Symmetry: C3
Subunit: 415 residues, 3 copies
């Protein structure tokens, strides 16, 4: 049974933030959230978090998590509170990989104590590392400062043996395994916004590299952001300044245009998304054409072959096979069938000021331009709606439903 200890008490005053250090964002998630995620991935029997200043916010943020919280009112003094195997992690060192921490556990269980070390080209200011001791640069004599192997602070000690060493802090070899991380930023902490941004860029760069190793094409991998997870097929092409948030999926041959933003969205094979389209909680079928300037909101579901054009907003609406809304329109709380056409300026009036109501549009329907569909209304298959109509009664299958222009000659416009 492996338990993880997380130090998350730092105020991080260099952040100049009102929130505790470990709630600062990195790729769309608080620092501490990254570490809790890895600790849950390790199948940790227990997770104990040391909070400090502002711990109310932290406990509030992770309330639905089975964590044993501990107040801290030094790093050695901080761990001492946990006495009332184990990993020692830092809330502000967020990117340590589960494969590294397991690698540390296997070598520590055979010895009873392990740690992560790292070789740095420039070790100025860091603590210097059979391992014999660690001398911090502040108190380290000039001779030891030439060491380029530095300390990371990440330890793994047996639960039994920790209790013997922990109170006597006024040591381990007297009664030490080590590994180095696969990537240096795994063990990198942050103290201010400069360091937060530099780690963000290291993380994004590595994420783009891993996607390219999977076969993704990037117009510019330095202008890409993943804040979560994405599942990708083959021949996926991603243009500049795309952002991907939450958990997304991109099918085979999916092409994502410049500046598109996807959150909690799946896009099936063959779809081409033109530039500046944003998705949140959308499900997009195969061989669709979207954008530019399309906005899909939660509940937007597009069947295969659907076309969505510019300045289009789809919210909580399913659009059946091959239907098109090429021009500016608002489709909300709507069910639209197959092979239907939504004219420019069409609006679902889905909100009466208090409640939402459903619009139902059949197959092979033509909704003429500048139409207002007052929900709840059903428009049967094959029907046609005249341009500029306000529609309140259900339109029969195959029916044309439409809602007197006056002319004055030789009219002079105001001067």
């Amino acid at each position: 049974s492996t338990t993880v200890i997380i130090l998350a008490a730092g105020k991080g005053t260099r952040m100049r933030s009102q929130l505790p250090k470990v709630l600062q964002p990195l790729a769309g998630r608080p620092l501490l959230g990254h570490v809790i995620k890895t600790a849950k991935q390790l199948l940790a029997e227990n997770i104990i978090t040391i909070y400090g200043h502002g711990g109310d916010h932290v406990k509030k943020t992770f309330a639905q998590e089975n964590i044993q919280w501990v107040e801290q009112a030094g790093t050695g003094h901080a761990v001492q509170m946990t006495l009332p195997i184990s990993l020692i992690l830092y809330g502000d060192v967020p990117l340590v990989r589960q494969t590294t921490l397991e690698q540390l556990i296997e070598v520590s269980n055979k010895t009873g104590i392990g740690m992560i070390t790292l070789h740095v080209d420039n070790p100025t200011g860091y603590g210097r590392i059979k391992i014999q001791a660690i001398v911090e640069h502040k108190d380290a004599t000039e001779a030891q400062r030439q060491i380029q192997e530095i300390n990371t602070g990440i330890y793994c000690v047996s639960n039994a043996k920790l209790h013997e060493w922990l109170p006597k802090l006024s040591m381990a070899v007297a009664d030490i395994a080590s590994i180095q991380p696969e990537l240096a930023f795994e063990v990198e902490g942050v103290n201010d916004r400069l360091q937060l941004a530099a780690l963000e860029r290291e993380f994004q760069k590595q994420q783009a590299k891993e996607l390219m190793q999977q076969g993704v094409t990037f117009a510019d991998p330095a202008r890409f952001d993943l804040r979560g997870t994405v599942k990708v097929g083959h021949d996926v092409r991603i243009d500049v300044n795309v952002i991907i948030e939450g958990n997304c999926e991109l099918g085979d041959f999916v092409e994502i245009g410049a500046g598109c933003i996807l959150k909690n969205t799946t896009i099936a094979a063959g779809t081409k998304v033109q530039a500046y389209s944003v998705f949140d909680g959308a499900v997009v079928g195969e061989n669709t054409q979207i954008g530019p300037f399309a906005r899909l909101r939660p509940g937007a579901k597009l069947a295969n072959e659907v076309h969505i054009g510019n300045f289009v907003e789809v919210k909580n609406t399913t659009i059946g096979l091959g239907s098109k809304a090429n021009h500016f329109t608002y489709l909300g709380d709507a069910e639209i069938g197959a092979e239907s056409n939504i004219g420019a300026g069409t609006i679902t009036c889905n909100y009466d000021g208090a409640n939402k109501h459903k619009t139902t549009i059949g197959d092979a329907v033509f909704i003429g331009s500048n139409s207002s569909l007052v929900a709840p209304v059903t428009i049967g298959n094959g029907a046609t709606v005249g341009a500029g109509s306000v529609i309140t009664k259900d339109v029969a299958e195959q029916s044309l439903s439409f809602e007197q222009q006056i002319s004055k000659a030789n009219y002079q416009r105001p001067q």
Copy 2:
């Protein structure tokens, strides 16, 4: 204090029709950066030496009380003699020199009567060499005229001097670096300082150097904001073209541009690709991606975007929600009101707790004049309504979808369009 700016260079490598000092850097001409800095220093007089294209330059800075002079670099300052306390000698094409550096130079120069800014560079090729015997500056030798031993000097001349107006009149009556030896000849000891940042004293000659100086400036500006506590998703994808005041816990996503004078309150979140110009945004507001603001005033805990367009006079109270493909121009929107869908609100006054449906349009323009639309509190404007200004929609009123409003709608009243549903059965489309 008077500032003398050398702004005669043609800058032919720019391959531009405008003189060099009108090329852009962070949203303002090169010379404008220097004039701005000269005004920060409280210069009694500002004298600018112009050359090719001086008509454009004088026209561009017409509302600035500067004494213009027509046109070697030493010969250039000599032409200013009819027009000159102390004076600073700056270059119009070296725009990013800071006022704190120029003040630092004045403190050491006032003690001697002549000081200068120098710089250490790894490669000093082509620059003038600062020759110091026992720590005191003796002369400046231009790279062309420098002995082989002297070419090893890595402290170079920047061309930025602070000289007494009295001593200048004796020295000026060809290269300006000869004023150094002239100074040691009269017994004065050339003071020196170095800038805190090398790009402060950097000139530009073509578009390559212009872009690299721009990127140096932007990197430094994002760094200073990060030191204040701003968060950047990517500090290399950020542009400041003016000034911005920030609160704590401000978060700025990628490719944000900030122009003019802006303000960002506490906990403000600016999404990807937003562009803000002369706009204030108060605490708690979240701006979604691709929203652009010009002359906007935004309250607390508002929700804006994505794809919002706010234009001058747009004023949003606290709790307002503005959604996608929305254009607000010269319009005030009261507390907690919503316009979540595509709409044009122009020249309008909107009350509190009101709802603007998709497709609503203020018809504010009759082809010649603009007219005001006035919307009260707790008004519901149904979708695709055309509001023909001037018109008032009183509190608690409701407007039916697809309505054209030309008469004032009474408080608590419903106005809706008589819409007869006409059906033709079994209709075949063409």
Copy 3:
């Protein structure tokens, strides 16, 4: 007579693609397309392409190109690939040997290679690299090329050679017809090495000419997406640099993409994250705002394009004001002084001098005159479900807001259309057409709770 031979058979396994390697994209064009374009610039009499796996796609992609296709069913070396060209290889003249996955080689470089190889009968392109690890080494005896030794086989002394092989040769076809059948695979890999023709040429008493490219990425190949992205960035960086040398201003030249050609005037200003596709033109003093994307569009002098405007097949005159969030589609033609505002879509529409559409609108299949105004919410209803129809708007027409113009319809000069109108009949010159008021008022209405 000059012939170009393109080796385009690689599967490109590290691309993890379903497509052959040479159809992967670079600056908006498949790799092989860049080389076919340069080969046509050289005025090549013949173009012979060696395909392998997936040649059906390749043949389909360049079907409207006069290419002689040659299959390489088994992959047994580049020399074995060139051997395949013998049934269709000419007897006189010279041939260039290029790679489909080495796309950015410039025509000026290949001309220099042709000029020095005409003097000897065989030349090749070489390159000096700081680290030559993994490359084939150019072996010179008394300064004359004798062989290429692959990194696998090079002794420690030979690995110090920093002159590497690019694989790009210019050879007389007669000597190729003599050398290609006598190629030997009696080595370790069992492959027919193309470099053996260097050994055969020196054996015949020929001197091997050589040149170096002006830019190293000209001769760089790609095997995976990392290399693809790194070459793309190298190409874009170089493209922005050349535009700046011409006088273009960039807010950030590292946030710029040219995927085609662009002709530019003086004092052109290009903001961040602009993309340029196909063939474009920007006149003097044109300003392109942040994030704009232009494809096959010309923009004349003085026009100011605000941010997030997208153009495809547009023709834009002088001193127009466009965007932000403008969308121009093929056939969009704007006269001088036109203003296009936000959330505006123009498709196959001509707009005359000084006319304005400042607010959200769809103008499709329309002809619009001069000094006319399009109100917010205006729509040309151009599509009846089967055919498209034209909307005609005259000079100094005022189209009030939320108007639906049902094509085909004409709105005459000086006419005025009331807000919220549906127009189906032609509107006369100087005439007003408006919708009869139909607002019903009910006092003290309580909305649902």
